[PDB]
Amino acid sequence: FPNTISIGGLFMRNTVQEHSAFRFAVQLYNTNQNTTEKPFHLNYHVDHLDSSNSFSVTNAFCSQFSRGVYAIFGFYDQMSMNTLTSFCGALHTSFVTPSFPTDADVQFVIQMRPALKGAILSLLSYYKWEKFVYLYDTERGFSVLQAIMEAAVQNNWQVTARSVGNIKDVQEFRRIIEEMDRRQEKRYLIDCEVERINTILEQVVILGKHSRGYHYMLANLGFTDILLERVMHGGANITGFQIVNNENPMVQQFIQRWVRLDEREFPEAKNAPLKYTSALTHDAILVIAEAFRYLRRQRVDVSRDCLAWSQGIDIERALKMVQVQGMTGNIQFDTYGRRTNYTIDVYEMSRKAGYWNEYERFVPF
Amino acid sequence: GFPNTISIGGLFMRNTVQEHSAFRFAVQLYNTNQNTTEKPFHLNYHVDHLDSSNSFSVTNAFCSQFSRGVYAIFGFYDQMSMNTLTSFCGALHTSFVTPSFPTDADVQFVIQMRPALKGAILSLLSYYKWEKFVYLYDTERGFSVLQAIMEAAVQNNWQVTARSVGNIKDVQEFRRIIEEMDRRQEKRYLIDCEVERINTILEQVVILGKHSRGYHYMLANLGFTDILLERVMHGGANITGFQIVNNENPMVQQFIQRWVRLDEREFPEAKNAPLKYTSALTHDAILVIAEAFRYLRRQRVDVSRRCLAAVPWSQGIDIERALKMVQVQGMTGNIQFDTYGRRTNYTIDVYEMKVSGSRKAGYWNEYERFVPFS
Ligand SMILES: *[C@@H]1O[C@H](CO)[C@@H](O)[C@H](O)[C@H]1NC(C)=O
Ligand SMILES: *[C@@H]1O[C@H](CO)[C@@H](O)[C@H](O)[C@H]1NC(C)=O
Ligand SMILES: *[C@@H]1O[C@H](CO)[C@@H](O)[C@H](O)[C@H]1NC(C)=O
Ligand SMILES: *[C@@H]1O[C@H](CO)[C@@H](O)[C@H](O)[C@H]1NC(C)=O
Ligand SMILES: *[C@@H]1O[C@H](CO)[C@@H](O)[C@H](O)[C@H]1NC(C)=O
């Protein structure tokens, strides 16, 4: 079993904090002196990439592949997802990611972020929504949209859906909101990226739709990065979802060290709030370390030019069989690398209103 | 000066045998014209077959064409390869000309030969005054139709029971969905699936029995002529279909007359299967490419030259523009493009089969919307 396990790191635009979290989590692993928790050194090589270009994506993947890595941690968007994950799959290198999960049956991808659709549909039912507005972008795929369409008639949901991910002129958001008001819509499900959600909620406040009698359900696990204070102060209801629990001691002990890091070596640790994707980045290193510790205890042989490895299968299986407690709670996977047996906490405005899991569905406090 | 030979790439996938025959045949038809105004340069190609839509296969095939030096690439993508392939083309300013499913997305360097279907579907749903209906779909052609239905449903009073069926392996699951839909009193189905999948669904309709008379199946796929619907039609179903090839069009007739006489060994699938609309689009792709390059020559445009360093080719933008500005008459009717390489000013013909008989019911275009024949 090698003394050093090397992993790749594939970072994109807008992942600076996660890159700091990645370096910090690797440091936390390596500086443990308990040699049962640290029986090998963890090394990485980072590449930064532009997703919109196959050349940059393929180049970064190939740079890691030729270097010899036992797994790749990284990020994708809609443009790069298939490129990156299909490369990993073809070469049997496991990709561990905090990026949006897929519905698709895919191999060699460990999807750290749990699916949100179940929790959304349970809360729509719990609140007895019938008429509602569905504002969405497609940057996290179509899983939520499809689940709503499958269930709508059977739940009597009358969904006015508006695709908003291509809107550049904020006046277009304003006209949609105005149109929805003339149809007496009070309830909005917003399935967008955090930055987009913030833009939409500012338009809500500008138009005065942030009073009592309106309800915004924000379908994004990035709840703590949403600027919703101004909406809350007007009296409208807000519902949100999180997978990081501030009362979890692992979260508390990470945060206490994290906020004290040097801003020069760890940008965005000290000023910016911790993104849930940075928590998932920490949790990715936990999963990788556990899998490789498992392989070593079982005496599995891990061994080790991209365009011109059956130890890959063993690594993938070891990754998917982990059961660990992380900043994002209980971490386990199914055979497609999807989180299973996870919990989503549900927030109302600023308190925790209940929780959601796959077996109990939504349980209100 | 303008080169005596223009070379294009060809990127072919699994299950594109007929289209590959149509590509070679259309290149032959271009090259064997003796009128030197219609043929001022030789058209050459280099073909790669993509053993998979995984990135390894796709990157190798793209890089092989790029190093060969091609002035444009004709080819195919699926959901797995679309972004990989089109982004490679886009980064190098090489235009990709394709009969594959179009996208909603604003992309550059992609000439999308296949017209969008969503407009015609929504017009026919309105024309028939459907309110309650079943939407059975797969995602192999993207989400454009699904999103358009969802955007319009409340304003049109559509009560749409959507079922995603593209992952079904066991045909009994199709039977269970139908039985579930019967519990909801459903008679009207919009089926937005690949042809093979549509044929499986309609076989289950026939095996069940009692799902023809009183039912209406709107088949949202331009591959109408490959759909096996005879047994459904004989039981009294209504069927609505869509096509972009008119067999009475003289360009189609003169192509077909030669096509069906080609040698089966050099041109597999020309004699033993009807012409797939994607094969017609493949022919039309070569028409578009020839016209664009004839135009570039007349304008004295510099077309000189043609992986993994990104350095776009300077001449690429001019080639793309020439491609997108064409206005030509093809097997798929009038061919024009918008700035994103989407077909514009195209016609979709609408077919109805009912127990009284079978006919062309009308046509659809963006400006006239749905026009019924008498
Ligand atoms: C806001 O929440 C309250 C209970 O907290 C609920 O009764 C009310 O209906 C909600 N508003 C809307 C528009 O649904
Ligand atoms: C789910 O997770 C809990 C830990 O929170 C564990 O005790 C339980 O056994 C797990 N259930 C499974 C694997 O089905
Ligand atoms: C050759 O084709 C051109 C372009 O359509 C046409 O205008 C011309 O009349 C043809 N010439 C002959 C000799 O047939
Ligand atoms: C079948 O077509 C006839 C018109 O020819 C129409 O009246 C009927 O509604 C259609 N059937 C269904 C189930 O829509
Ligand atoms: C649309 O196509 C027809 C031929 O089908 C052509 O006569 C007409 O000029 C075109 N219209 C536009 C707006 O380009």
From Swiss-Prot, chain B:
Localization per Swiss-Prot or TrEMBL: Cell membrane; Postsynaptic cell membrane; Postsynaptic density membrane
Coiled-coil segments: none
Annotated disulfide bonds: C63-C307
Extracellular side: 1-374
Glycan attachment positions: N35, N238, N345
Subunit structure comment from the entry: Homotetramer or heterotetramer of pore-forming glutamate receptor subunits. Tetramers may be formed by the dimerization of dimers. Interacts with PICK1, GRIP1 and GRIP2. Found in a complex with GRIA1, GRIA2, GRIA4, CNIH2, CNIH3, CACNG2, CACNG3, CACNG4, CACNG5, CACNG7 and CACNG8. Interacts with CACNG5. Found in a complex with GRIA1, GRIA2, GRIA4, DLG4, CACNG8 and CNIH2.
Miscellaneous comment text of the record: The postsynaptic actions of Glu are mediated by a variety of receptors that are named according to their selective agonists. This receptor binds AMPA (quisqualate) > glutamate > kainate.
Similarity section: Belongs to the glutamate-gated ion channel (TC 1.A.10.1) family. GRIA3 subfamily.
Function: Ionotropic glutamate receptor that functions as a ligand-gated cation channel, gated by L-glutamate and glutamatergic agonists such as alpha-amino-3-hydroxy-5-methyl-4-isoxazolepropionic acid (AMPA), quisqualic acid, and kainic acid. L-glutamate acts as an excitatory neurotransmitter at many synapses in the central nervous system and plays an important role in fast excitatory synaptic transmission by inducing long-term potentiation.
Name of this chain's protein: Glutamate receptor 3
Organism: Rattus norvegicus (Rat)
Covered residues, full protein: 23 to 403 of 888
